[PDB]
Amino acid sequence: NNTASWFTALTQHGKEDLKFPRGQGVPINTNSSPDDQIGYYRRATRRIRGGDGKMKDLSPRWYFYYLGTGPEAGLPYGANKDGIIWVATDGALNTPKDHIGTRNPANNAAIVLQLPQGTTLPKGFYAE
């Protein structure tokens, strides 16, 4: 368990935690099928030495992982845990996606996180 998300991160520049309305939020991946469109975003916080010499938090990043993969590969869909939010497209199956898995940066670039037309990013969220 030393995983890389298949996608680039969503950066939280605002004060609200990430959330999506039911049916929205699964990044587009042409190498996946309708049954696979389900997973979670996990908040990844980073700290840095600021200009004044004090440690400070950077804007949190949220990375998507297919259900049954990634840092919370053992969590069932819908499990309540701080820093974890769930997303699923209509018709997705609630089964682990080991056949998609996570990405190896040695042989695959991250896929730029894109969401379909009818879905906008929540307040304070940016796909950098």
Numbering used by the authors: 47 to 174
From the reporting publication:
One central protein involved in the formation of regulatory ribonucleoprotein complexes (RNP) is the coronaviral structural protein nucleocapsid (N).
All crystal structures of nat_mutants with WT-like RNA-binding (nat_mutants P67S, A119S, E136D and P151S) superimpose well with the NTD WT with RMSD values between 0.592 and 1.776 Å. Mutated residues in the above-named nat_mutants lie peripheral to the structural core, which further supports both the converging structures and the unaltered apparent RNA-binding affinities. High-resolution crystal structures supported by solution NMR data reveal that all six nat_mutants are overall conservative regarding fold and functionality.
